Amino acid sequence: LRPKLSEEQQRIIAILLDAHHKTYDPTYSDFCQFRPPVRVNDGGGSVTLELSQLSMLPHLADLVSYSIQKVIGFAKMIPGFRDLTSEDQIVLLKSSAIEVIMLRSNESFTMDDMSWTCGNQDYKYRVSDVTKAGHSLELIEPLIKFQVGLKKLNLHEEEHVLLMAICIVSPDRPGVQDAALIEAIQDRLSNTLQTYIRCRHPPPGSHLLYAKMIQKLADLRSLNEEHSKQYRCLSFQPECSMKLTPLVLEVFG
Ligand SMILES: C[C@H](CC#CC(C)(C)O)[C@H]1CCC2/C(=C/C=C3C[C@@H](O)C[C@H](O)C3)CCC[C@@]21C
Numbered sequence: 286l287r288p289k290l291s292e293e294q295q296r297i298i299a300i301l302l303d304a305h306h307k308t309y310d311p312t313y314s315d316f317c318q319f320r321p322p323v324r325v326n327d328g329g330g331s332v333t334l335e336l337s338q339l340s341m342l343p344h345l346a347d348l349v350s351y352s353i354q355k356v357i358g359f360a361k362m363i364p365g366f367r368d369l370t371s372e373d374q375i376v377l378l379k380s381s382a383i384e385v386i387m388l389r390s391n392e393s394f395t396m397d398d399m400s401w402t403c404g405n406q407d408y409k410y411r412v413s414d415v416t417k418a419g420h421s422l423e424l425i426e427p428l429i430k431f432q433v434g435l436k437k438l439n440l441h442e443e444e445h446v447l448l449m450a451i452c453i454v455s456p457d458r459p460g461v462q463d464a465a466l467i468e469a470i471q472d473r474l475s476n477t478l479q480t481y482i483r484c485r486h487p488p489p490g491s492h493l494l495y496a497k498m499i500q501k502l503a504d505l506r507s508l509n510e511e512h513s514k515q516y517r518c519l520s521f522q523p524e525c526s527m528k529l530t531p532l533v534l535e536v537f538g
Contacts, residue, residue, distance in 0.1 A: 287483050287484055288484070289480075289484060290477070290480055290481060290484060290485075294480060294481070296364075297364050297473070297477050298443050298446075298447070298477065298481065300362060300364060301363070301443075301446040301447060301450055302442060302443065303362075304358075304359050304362035305359060305442070305446045305449075307358070307362075309355065309359075311392070312404070313393070313408060315351065316348070316404065319344055319351065320343035320344050320346075320347050321343075321344060321407075322344040322407060322408070323340040323341060323344070324340060325340045325417065327413075327416070327417060330413075330416055332421070335416055335417055335419060336419060336522055338417075339417070339418065339419050339519075339525065339528055340417050340418075341414050341417035341418040342417075342419055342525075343528050345410075345415075346418075346528055346529045346530055346533055347530065349533060350529075350532045353382050353386070353532055353533070353536060354532070356378070356381075356382060356385045356386065356389070359449070360374075360378055360453050363453065363454060363470075363474075364470075364473070365470035365473065366453075366454065366470070368466070368470075369466060369467065369470075370463065373461050373462055373466075376458060376459075377453055377454065377458055377461065377467070378453070379535075379536050380455075380460070380509075381453045381458070382536050382537075383508075383509055383512050383513075383537075384452055384505040384506075384509050385449050387428065387431065387505060387508060388445075388448065389449060390432075391432055391445075392445075394432045394436060396433060396436055398411075399429055399432075399433070412426075412429065415428075419518075419522070419525075420512075420519075421515065423511060424508070424512055427504075427508060427511070428508060431504050431508060434504075435501055438490075438494065438498070438501075440498075441486065443481055443485070444478065444481065444482065444494075444498070447474060447478040448478070448498055450474050451471055451474050451502065452502055452505065454467055454470045454471045454474065455467070455471060455502075456468040478495065478498070479495050482495050513537070516537050
């Protein structure tokens with residue numbers, strides 16, 4: 286059976302599309318306000334050199350910090366999010382922040398050359414730029430594989446925004462108090478997504494798409510864990526805090 290989207294489900298989708306359009310600038314016009322990207326010579330991918338310089342960290346830290354602010358704005362507009370306690374809202378945002386950034390970044394990722402292209406060549410980020418920020422291939426390679434996999438699903442914008450919302454409102458995050466309420470909120474979003482796919486998404490791949498999307502959420506958890514491990518290592522580097530931002534320090538600290 287392929288039941289039609291209820292008026293409420295249609296409303297949820299409209300609200301999320303609006304939230305995304307207000308919090309994701311497809312022109313990347315604010316990027317010139319971040320600390321400038323610096324790309325030193327490191328064809329050898331020397332960990333020692335990368336850690337001593339962290340040339341791309343200030344720029345990427347600003348980009349990530351800016352993104353967290355946009356994610357906070359998006360989350361506040363998710364139907365039901367405001368009904369949670371502030372304590373639970375913060376737990377959900379802090380635990381999902383890196384995952385939603387990875388998801389939303391798919392919009393600027395291009396399979397033409399496997400990079401995140403955000404306008405001019407100065408704002409084109411490749412694997413080599415991430416290593417210059419202190420991270421290693423143990424995170425980057427799986428990250429790129431994840432981006433290509435997500436890209437290949439060719440999600441409608443409606444599906445893309447529902448996925449980010451579902452990612453944020455997850456009941457199995459450590460520290461949440463009212464898991465039941467959170468689960469209820471997520472279920473409403475999941476049912477909307479499942480109904481949308483069967484009703485609005487044409488073949489091939491009509492079905493199975495939901496399963497593939499859910500698997501991506503599992504993939505994000507692993508990437509989250511690896512990023513946390515690497516962030517810890519990065520925090521050991523003297524004077525690193527100055528290259529980050531207060532928001533980044535709190536969310537990942
Ligand atoms: C591992 C990085 C995250 C980090 C970090 C620190 C340095 C804080 O550990 C990568 C996560 C995904 C990502 C990237 C995200 C890019 C997006 C630009 C635009 O799509 C708006 C998104 O909102 C942000 C590309 C360059 C490497 C990263 C910044």
